[PDB]
Amino acid sequence: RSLKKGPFIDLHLLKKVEKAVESGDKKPLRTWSRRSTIFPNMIGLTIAVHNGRQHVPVFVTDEMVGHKLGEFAPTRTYR
Amino acid sequence: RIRIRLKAFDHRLIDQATAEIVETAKRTGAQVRGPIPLPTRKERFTVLISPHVNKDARDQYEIRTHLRLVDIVEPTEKTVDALMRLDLAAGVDVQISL
Amino acid sequence: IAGINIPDHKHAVIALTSIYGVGKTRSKAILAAAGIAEDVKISELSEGQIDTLRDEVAKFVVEGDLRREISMSIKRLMDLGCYRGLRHRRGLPVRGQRTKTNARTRKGPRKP
Amino acid sequence: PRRRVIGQRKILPDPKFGSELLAKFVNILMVDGKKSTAESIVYSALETLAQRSGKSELEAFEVALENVRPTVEVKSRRVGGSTYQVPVEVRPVRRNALAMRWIVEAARKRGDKSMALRLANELSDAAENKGTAVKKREDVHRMAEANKAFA
Amino acid sequence: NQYYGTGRRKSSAARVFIKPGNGKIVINQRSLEQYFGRETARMVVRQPLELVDMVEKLDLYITVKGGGISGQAGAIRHGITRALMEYDESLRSELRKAGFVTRDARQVERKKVGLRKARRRPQFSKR
Amino acid sequence: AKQSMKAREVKRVALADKYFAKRAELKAIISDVNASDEDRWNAVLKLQTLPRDSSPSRQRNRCRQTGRPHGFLRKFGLSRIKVREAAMRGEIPGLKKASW
Amino acid sequence: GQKVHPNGIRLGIVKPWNSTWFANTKEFADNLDSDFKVRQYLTKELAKASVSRIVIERPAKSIRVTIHTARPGIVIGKKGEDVEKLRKVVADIAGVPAQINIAEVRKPELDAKLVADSITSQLERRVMFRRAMKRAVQNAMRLGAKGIKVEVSGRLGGAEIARTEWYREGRVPLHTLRADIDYNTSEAHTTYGVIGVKVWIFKGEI
Amino acid sequence: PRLGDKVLEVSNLRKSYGDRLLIDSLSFSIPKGAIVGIIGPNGAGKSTLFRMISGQEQPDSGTITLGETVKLASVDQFR
RNA sequence: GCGGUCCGGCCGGGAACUCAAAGGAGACUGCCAGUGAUAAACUGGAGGAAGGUGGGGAUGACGUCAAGUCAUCAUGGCCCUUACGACCAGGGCUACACACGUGCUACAAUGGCGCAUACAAAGAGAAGCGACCUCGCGAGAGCAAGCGGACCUCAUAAAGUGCGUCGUAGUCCGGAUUGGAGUCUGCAACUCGACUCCAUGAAGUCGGAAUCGCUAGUAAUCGUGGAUCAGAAUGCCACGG
């Protein structure tokens, strides 16, 4: 569904995560990279992701590692 | 030896070019293979003729590519000298093998 | 007759498909691995071979384990807060089909 | 129709039996353009009727046909804003056609076994004045008698 | 010493040789039963020379290309008809009266843009 | 057709020809069974750092005369409307009215 | 809109083509673009030259443009200098060597493109539309023509509501495929919008 | 309960008592939705047929069968 | 046809045949009889492959609906012109109590599923079609010829037939919907791709009033191709059984 080899992540979002574990837990990371998957070294972070109009924050949990950030940010609001 | 293939969009025009080419090979006197009409091609295009929504109203056009073969087999140096640079066919492409 | 539940009256290949978790090819693989003829029925099988069938089925997640496994999957997605989980909660299609006119299976029988 | 008199298509004779009468029957039982299936069913069903009747192959088909082919029929023939069906005679060509259609339709009913048997049963009942086809010919014959006033 | 006809029907073409010997047929280097006896389409192939009392005077070499089962059967039957002019045309009237001389020009219609298949209009609605 | 959009097509074609025509080692070479000792990883990341106009996907292939995105025909390079306009006055060589 | 294009329907029957070259798919699109640039530049340049037909043939990796005109000297300019300053600009727009030839038509009132062009110039010259079309029809008929139809559509004379007016003299069978029917279109950009002019000139039955 | 197309079928049914025989080589199938008027003289076997269908009697020539959807409700000649 | 055999047009070879080309002949009520106003024409017949515009396509009169398109374009007026113009990322056009139009797959035995095997036409291909072979249960992945093509590839056609089984059950019908595992293309498949494998097995047992298409290679059914297209047809456009 993604590829045989080489899981995908945007470079800018990878760099912000490495800077996070270097500087520890910090303020939420505001990113628009709804396509980049989750790595284990993002767990414990409260990164915020775009939903088209606002950055909805998502607190990364152990389970959410095989998914993508946009999977936890709905786009269209209904009722 | 050398085989000449001619493509064109007009059969009244290609038959002239292929007859002129076979004649020039025959200007050596004899021993030419004769023209061979390989099967043509009919590309077809269907386009909507309206600038807006009328899907059932459309025209269909086709481009017919007529194609002949010569296949000169006589290794006459006079033939190749008078073949290249002297056929002078316009509107019709020439391939000629070796 | 065993295999957790009861397979009845059918050819061993297709009777075994009654196991929640065994379909056409898994049942073919089981009968191949048990050395049982495909064309024979469940009433012609010896008790000295059904025990092998139990052994063969044991190498697969089946009714009790499978239905728990599926329930864990859907609940983990529902509790996850992801889009697939949200679609599971609200009952809407998850694979990304139309909801404008279709999706009567997931939505259920029509109601105004 | 409105203008002309249309031509015929002359049909092709039945392979096994040299009669075009059975060829038209195969064409009627035909569905979806599958003629090989249609002839296969007719041949098998007519063969397993030969064991049930005694007549060879074709006599046992006609004596079934002659029982379910009607003679008169009612058609809507209003005049003054009317709503009553005038009983009219059936031309000989349509008599065979109406017979074959009724047999095949009845055979597609009476679901008992594969199509080979369903056809086989119906012709045997037609050969003895009993089936749903021969019942249908009686229904139209009875509907024309009830309307015999209009002529 | 062979006599030939082509025969055509429904996008299929045939070649038939009527060389005179004992009665037998070969189609694409095999007989009808193995090649064409399928679907029992042998009646039409047999039909022309059966009417002309085929018996033991014709051995047939048959080739065919294109078209389906029935289309090839019509081509061979038409080919045999055109083939059986070596016994001079004294039988031409006796063979044409039953047909087999018409080429049967009828064939598939083009798709007819705007429709489904050449006559099948899509479903209509006033509203 | 919104000249800005025609400029976008030229900019993408300019960039698509600049990198991907010669440079193809990331998408092609690196994605084989080669050793992936973080070198496949970096070439994966290297693709992100490249400009977004990666040759095949980003272009629209619209009509040359009007810039119409829909109804394009590759044989002529025009949309359906400009093909018929040019065909009817004999611009396109060989394009007969056609029927069968 | 219900009429087929008179030129297009006869392209392989009686009328010729305007481009006569062979190209595969690789360069079929690129050629068509180049001829469009050549024709568009030629027409806008030789507007005062009364150009009727521009036919382009591409022989032997070269482009040749034949410019059918009613005033050859105005295209040649001065013993050839206008030709050379077109052959360069044409070849500099195609990227390949270009040969420019011209063909005089000694019947400018019998050519549909010239006639339609003439009527549009008068419309921009504020000539009454009835006068222009009647003059065009009479000129072609007396000059020798089996028939001619002139149709002008738009806001004729500044009328707030448009109306199509056409005038036909003689025979002009739009359905006879062997008929030598010469048809062309033009537009007039008046101050009231566009006024479109169509001209049919029937000359012979085969 | 909903009834499938296969309801009841008897094949070559035959029953006798002592030396008098009531049913001899009877075969018939009952299509669904049908009402079957069983008529005949007294003691001809009308009630014994119901006995066989309900399974309280065993025919000599067997072959009485019901579809698996069939549920039988029987009303006796005697109260 | 001729003897040749690695039995396959492979092979020298031959223009006889299918073909695929161009150029030709052919069908015009031409001939006969009858009807008809000594007519136009009609009804039959011979001959022919074809018979009365042979089949069907292009072909759409003056005009109508001030019908449809200022979002293909062109264009008169208005308008915005540090924004109604321009660039970027993300989102949306894919939503979902419902309603309608057009379709595809079915509700089975004229069938499903296994094994064996026959017969097409048309078309497309160069940052493309991609043999063979190897590895994958598969989508395919690696290596890699050939082909700008009557040569190579896409490309084993499927309904058919032969055998066996299933025996009228919501089933060995139906193949939805969900859960895992994945392949590809693409910078990237979460919103929101296609495809494969394992598991699941939902409605549906032929459809109310009403309503649609079709007159012959037509309806019905079966498969194939192409355009658009990096990927994405149950639509469209074509082809044949």
Ligand SMILES: Nc1ncnc2c1ncn2[C@@H]1O[C@H](COP(=O)(O)OP(=O)(O)OP(=O)(O)O)[C@@H](O)[C@H]1O
């Ligand atoms: N066990 C038995 N031994 C001998 N004869 C028997 C036995 N049971 C029934 N019979 C006879 O066999 C016949 C079967 O009759 P049954 O009771 O089946 O009904 P019927 O006669 O068909 O109908 P009805 O009840 O309406 O009179 C009768 O003549 C009956 O007397």
Ligand SMILES: [Mg+2]
């Ligand atoms: Mg005749």
Ligand SMILES: [Mg+2]
């Ligand atoms: Mg078809």
Ligand SMILES: [Mg+2]
């Ligand atoms: Mg613009």
Ligand SMILES: [Mg+2]
């Ligand atoms: Mg694209």
Ligand SMILES: [Mg+2]
């Ligand atoms: Mg039109």
Ligand SMILES: [Mg+2]
């Ligand atoms: Mg006649």
Ligand SMILES: [Mg+2]
């Ligand atoms: Mg954007």
Ligand SMILES: [Mg+2]
């Ligand atoms: Mg199934």
Ligand SMILES: [Mg+2]
């Ligand atoms: Mg499955």
Ligand SMILES: [Mg+2]
């Ligand atoms: Mg109904």
